[PDB]
Amino acid sequence: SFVEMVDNLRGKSGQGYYVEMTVGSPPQTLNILVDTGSSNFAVGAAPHPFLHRYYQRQLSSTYRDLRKGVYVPYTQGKWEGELGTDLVSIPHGPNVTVRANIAAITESDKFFINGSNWEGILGLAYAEIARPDDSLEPFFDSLVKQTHVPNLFSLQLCGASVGGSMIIGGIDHSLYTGSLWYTPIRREWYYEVIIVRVEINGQDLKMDCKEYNYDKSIVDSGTTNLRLPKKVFEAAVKSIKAASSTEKFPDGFWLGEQLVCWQAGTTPWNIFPVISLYLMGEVTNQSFRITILPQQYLRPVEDVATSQDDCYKFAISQSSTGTVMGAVIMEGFYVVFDRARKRIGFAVSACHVHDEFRTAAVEGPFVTLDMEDCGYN
Ligand SMILES: CC(=O)COc1cc2cc(c1)C(=O)N[C@H]([C@H](O)CNCc1cccc(C(C)C)c1)Cc1cccc(c1)OCCCCO2
């Protein structure tokens, strides 16, 4: 019954992917950001300049107040609000209704994005990182516990405005080609994984693999960029600069601040390298890799001039909180969050990226010794 969930996600480039949900009785319809990088279900519940609608608890006969406040600080933005529960449904999802925790946002700071068309956030990660603490059951745990929906979901994020699929409760084989490759979920808080090797244009970055996961590596549909720890980011930017030195760019471009533009249809894709991330596999000493094309980490953006050029932002940036495999990394692929088996699956997506001499790929097996040394402690 998964065909009803294909193409149930929408978005704008760099403003997140959202799914339509309803809360309350009678149903109030809201667009909810799909975020595997957090664990709180939260919606606008008070007027805001960027909100076109919001949750009105007074109009819901099933609303229950929890008489507890809550605040969430993300890497970008923060909000505070009041906790409660209400009935929730996903129109283009499973045909069920769950009573779920809902944080009603009353104040926020650089959280809602002007023109993104979503009004709330659906944190799909685990209770351990829920606010105010791990006793607030996340939505997906409530869904699995109150229905027969199997304990997994999959995300097909399609690039540039944008669309995709969230298959709730299973895997839809028409959304990917080739084999699924699985990496263990290292610990159930974020969707934490272990990166064991990094290559740029086939050259190993030759860093101690601990650097790749200092202090963690997560799969996060709620973050746009590939974010890398300082030492790793510097190494990768140096390698990407050298591969593209045929042309030179402002240093503000390499920091994500300024665009780069080219005459429409003349983007020099071939001078930007491919990035290969090797992930811990399912059997001893075995890994696999996902290969990222520049069409993923050069994010297309609106024209800042009176021209019809093709303009891009560098979508790799620095982090002080570990590696973040953001939406730009996920866009090539079908990503299976197999919570039941504590693993994350990767396969080439049906909406894969098209370079003309190169292709995004998921390839294995590879042999990698001492993979467990790559995890940070
Ligand atoms: C250019 C870049 O890419 C820079 O960095 C970015 C960019 C970015 C969002 C985040 C970070 C962001 O913070 N996104 C969080 C995720 O949940 C974060 N996950 C990890 C995390 C970090 C800190 C604390 C927690 C707790 C709550 C568990 C979790 C979710 C989120 C918050 C606010 C707006 C969002 C989406 O709009 C979606 C469109 C993308 C917005 O662009």
CB atoms within 10 A of CB 98: 20
In a domain, 261, yes or no: yes
Instruction: Choose the final residue of a domain: 117, 134, 149.
Output: 149
d(CA 252, CA 248): 12
| Ramachandran region, residue 285 (left: φ > 0; alpha: ψ -120 to 50; beta: rest) | left
Residues 375, 252 share a domain: yes
Phi, psi (deg, nearest 5) at residue 349: -80, 150
d(CA 277, CA 195): 7
Beta pairing, strands 203-204 & 153-158: unpaired
CB atoms within 10 A of CB 48: 17
In a domain, 22, yes or no: yes
129 lines ligand 1 (CB under 6 A): yes
- Asked if 133 is an active-site residue, the reply is no
In a domain, 271, yes or no: yes
Residues 371, 237 share a domain: yes
Q: What burial class does residue 266 get, using C-beta atoms within 10 Å of its C-beta: 0-12 exposed, 13-18 middle, 19+ buried?
A: exposed
In a domain, 59, yes or no: yes
Cβ atoms of 121 and 42 within 8 Å: the answer is yes
Contacting residues for 46 by C-beta, under 8 A, at least 6 apart: 54, 104, 105, 106, 107
Structure tokens that stand for 260 in this block: 């780069």
Which H or E run contains 319?
strand 316-319
Residues 108, 188 share a domain: no
CA of 272 to the centre of ligand 1 (A): 26
Structure tokens that stand for 324 in this block: 């973040």
Residues 162, 88 share a domain: no
**Secondary structure of residue 132 in the 3-state scheme:** coil
Of the candidates 36, 62, 37, 371, the one whose C-alpha atom is nearest the C-alpha of residue 212 is 371
**Secondary structure of residue 162 in the 3-state scheme:** strand
DSSP code at position 274: P
Number of domains in the chain: 2
DSSP bridge partners of 359:
354
11 lines ligand 1 (CB under 6 A): no
In a domain, 3, yes or no: no
In a domain, 43, yes or no: yes
DSSP bridge partners of 182:
345
CATH number, domain of 36, equals 2.40.70.10
**Residues 242, 316, 361, 212: is their CA dihedral positive or negative?**
positive
d(CA 44, CA 340): 31
111 lines ligand 1 (CB under 6 A): yes
d(CA 328, CA 298): 9
| Structural domain of 127 | 17-149
Helices (H), 199-303: 230-243, 294-297
Residues 355, 225 share a domain: yes
Helices (H), 97-203: 139-146
- Asked if 35 is an active-site residue, the reply is yes
Residues 273, 161 share a domain: yes
Residues 337, 219 share a domain: yes
Complete edge-to-edge strand list for the sheet that includes strand 275-280:
203-204, 195-200, 275-280, 286-292, 361-367
71 lines ligand 1 (CB under 6 A): no
Cβ atoms of 98 and 25 within 8 Å: the answer is no
Instruction: Choose the final residue of a domain: 98, 126, 149.
Output: 149
Q: What burial class does residue 143 get, using C-beta atoms within 10 Å of its C-beta: 0-12 exposed, 13-18 middle, 19+ buried?
A: buried
Contacting residues for 193 by C-beta, under 8 A, at least 6 apart: 183, 184, 185, 186, 217, 218, 219, 279, 280, 325, 344
DSSP bridge partners of 279:
195, 288
CA of 69 to the centre of ligand 1 (A): 21
Residues 236, 250 share a domain: yes
Q: Which of 35, 86, 309, 338 is catalytic?
A: 35
- DSSP tally for the chain: helices H, then strands E: 4, 25
Residues 155, 142 share a domain: no
Residues 121, 182 share a domain: no
In a domain, 2, yes or no: no
Cβ atoms of 92 and 163 within 8 Å: the answer is no
Structure tokens that stand for 25 in this block: 């009785």
Of the candidates 217, 202, 139, the one whose C-alpha atom is nearest the C-alpha of residue 374 is 217
Q: Which of 86, 220, 309, 338 is catalytic?
A: 220
Q: Is the peptide bond before 27 cis (omega within 30 degrees of 0)?
A: no
Residues 161, 139 share a domain: no
Residues 205, 81 share a domain: no
CA dihedral 193→152→2→91, nearest 10 degrees, is -110
d(CA 185, CA 262): 40
Beta pairing, strands 217-219 & 323-325: parallel
Instruction: Choose the final residue of a domain: 111, 132, 149.
Output: 149
d(CA 74, CA 343): 25
In a domain, 182, yes or no: yes
